[PDB]
Design a protein around this nucleic acid. Sequence first.
RNA 1: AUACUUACCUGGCAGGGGAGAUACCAUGAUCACGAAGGUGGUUUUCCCAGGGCGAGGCUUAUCCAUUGCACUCCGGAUGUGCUGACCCCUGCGAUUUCCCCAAAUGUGGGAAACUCGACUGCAUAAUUUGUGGUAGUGGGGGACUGCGUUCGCGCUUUCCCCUG
Lengths: 186, 86, 46, 95, 73, 81, 81, 77
Amino acid sequence: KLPHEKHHNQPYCGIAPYIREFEDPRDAPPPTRAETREERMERKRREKIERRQQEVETELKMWDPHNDPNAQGDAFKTLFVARVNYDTTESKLRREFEVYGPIKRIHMVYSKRSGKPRGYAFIEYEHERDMHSAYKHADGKKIDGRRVLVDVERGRTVKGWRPRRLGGGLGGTRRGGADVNIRHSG
Amino acid sequence: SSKMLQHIDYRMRCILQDGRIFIGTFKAFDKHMNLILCDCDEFRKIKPKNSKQAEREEKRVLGLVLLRGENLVSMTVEGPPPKDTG
Amino acid sequence: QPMIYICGECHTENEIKSRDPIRCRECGYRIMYKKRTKRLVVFDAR
Amino acid sequence: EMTPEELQKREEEEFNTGPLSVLTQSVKNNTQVLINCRNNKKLLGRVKAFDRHCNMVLENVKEMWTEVKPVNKDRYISKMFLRGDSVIVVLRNPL
Amino acid sequence: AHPPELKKFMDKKLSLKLNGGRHVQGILRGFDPFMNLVIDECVEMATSGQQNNIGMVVIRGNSIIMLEALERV
Amino acid sequence: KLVRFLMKLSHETVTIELKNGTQVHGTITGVDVSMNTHLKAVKMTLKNREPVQLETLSIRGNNIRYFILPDSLPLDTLLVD
Amino acid sequence: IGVPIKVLHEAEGHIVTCETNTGEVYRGKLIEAEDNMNCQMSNITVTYRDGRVAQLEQVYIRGSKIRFLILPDMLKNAPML
Amino acid sequence: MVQPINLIFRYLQNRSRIQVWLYEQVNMRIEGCIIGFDEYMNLVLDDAEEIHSKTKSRKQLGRIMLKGDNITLLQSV
RNA sequence: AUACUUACCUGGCAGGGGAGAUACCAUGAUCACGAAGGUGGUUUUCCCAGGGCGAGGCUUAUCCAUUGCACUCCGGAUGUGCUGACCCCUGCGAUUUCCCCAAAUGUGGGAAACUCGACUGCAUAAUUUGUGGUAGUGGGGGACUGCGUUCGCGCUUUCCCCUG
Ligand SMILES: [Zn+2]
């Protein structure tokens, strides 16, 4: 028959006379709440993160950035250049950074164990003004075909500054995919 | 989606929501399940209100029919397709 | 229209437009060179 | 939807804080639930999973209904799959 | 979202059938892709022979079942 | 989603009830996104009718009321996706 | 588009029958057909669920509210089939 | 060309008592002054009255809402 | 034949099996040797998600030969319908450009480019199919009420039984 002319001899009733659930104290099994390949991963991410944070506190307590034999000269005078090509000779870096002013000292950092060039150096100019003059112009320079950025080294100037391994730094060349453009420079 | 392609041209009986049975040659379908039946016949089960009598069947020839998937419940093979060989 | 020039320092190709100040976009180096023409050139081997 | 991007988690926040959270909390605490369906029958059982379509995965269910004097009829189904459109009402354990 | 080709029935006296065995009769003035029709000079046409004219009304396409043109378009 | 889980129950035997009171017991062979399921070597039982064995049956998802799955189904492992 | 929809578009202009969810069956000439199954007919013969009939001249029907359609058997000879 | 949306907006501004029919139900109807409406056709009334043909009793409801799917036919006053 | 400005006519977005393990490559990480992770590869286990190889094995007829002395299955070939270990691509029908192997116009490999498919997700549970007003809610045999009656029946009120 049709839905409108159908004689409902027993239409839908309620549920008021059909409440026969189990008592409250009869709680559900506590151990029956878990999932695989969803929580163990978060657990491993939390442990590796806390383990690193603790290694960070130990490194900060053991090593002192300011009290570094390699670091020398006035902090406001020293400069920091990174993304430098590994083939850049010391003389090439001199000819490129003496233009802004005479260089009292130049320091090329090297791997402690591997000895390979790190790719960044600290340049100490004779005058603080030569450094400030280089701050704006040096950033974006091209040495040996690879672009390089330049900013005043904040390791001993900015309060609360630390490198990548300690959670700080700048630049996102290795941040979330498709979130930091490689064309933009510091 | 060979589950439906393998069954093309077979003599299928479609079960309607109202209880009817449309038996015809399943020709083609679509995502909505709208079927095309050739030489279809409609059967319906009527309850006996007079006495304990055999179920009353009222056959009805239709020919070419287009059934809406929303109105289609299920479908099964009544028999192989009409053999064209002598 | 493109006008590719080769930078002296980094030897990099780069487009330059008319009225555009001459400076390699890559290294800020102000010396560039026109690329070798495409015109057909022949030399009798005399 | 308001968030046409493919990374939208609207269904997520919906199940977490919306009306459909009754089923999330039901599967979390493993609590029973009684459902009134279009079959005029009530199904009492636990839930293990669901989605936006209100299709729940039940276990240890007990179907119950009445016909006509009115006589009651009940049976048991240890594992089944309920549809959403046919659902009328849901009621968690009020305890 | 192609709308229905109801331009023929525009400004014509129709008699529509609804879901619950109900019928109406009025002159059509506009439609929509969802079959939302707007008919004027509409009569209720209840189950009994009694007639009740109210005039301008609106009908939902989800409940509109059939529309016949008494003026043969 | 969950229909993927429904599509993962191929080769297993279940008992589905329809919105018209019809019962159907058989093995699943294929499912679509619209919940339409194909059961082979199935037995159907319409309301107030006699059971009948059908070698195949393609059912739509709209007219389905509910399913009855085996007792040994690994829900915790099968709901991971 | 769908194959049944195409079969309907080519079925345009011929005598066809249409049954709706309310049970009424209308048989007459088809005037216009659309992708959404909306069908317009002319000079039709209606049969109600009780059996009574009536006479109409120009009728339009919504597609979603149609149970099924009967078309000329000769349409089976279409080139796509 | 008047559309249903514009007509509903006119009835709304006029605050006229619009009556509404139910889907699949002929005996009961509802009447009230519309306050607003959405694309889903859901309608809100300030003072609703449920009237039945058989009983002819008008049950007062007050500020209420009605689903668009349940609507079947609108009527003025 | 090209570009420029305007009017008119056509059109739905994202992609390229998925979950673990990766000591190793790229990202040569912005602070005095360092990240992890992530992203794009390579390596490595699976639900096997589709295919290719059809060796081996199962069912039954046709043809040839055998009179045979075995007790550890088994004569050779053809046809019908099946299964199938191991080993390969992570999946495209078509088109365009660069480089290379080459039996050098063909046969192939490493790269992308944006073009049609109805492959998937969201507009898809908000009126037109992919998330319900098509609920399934009964039928029949005996006793057991009433109204009308053509005594066949329409409506209506009870108990016991078979049937779903
Ligand atoms: Zn340069």
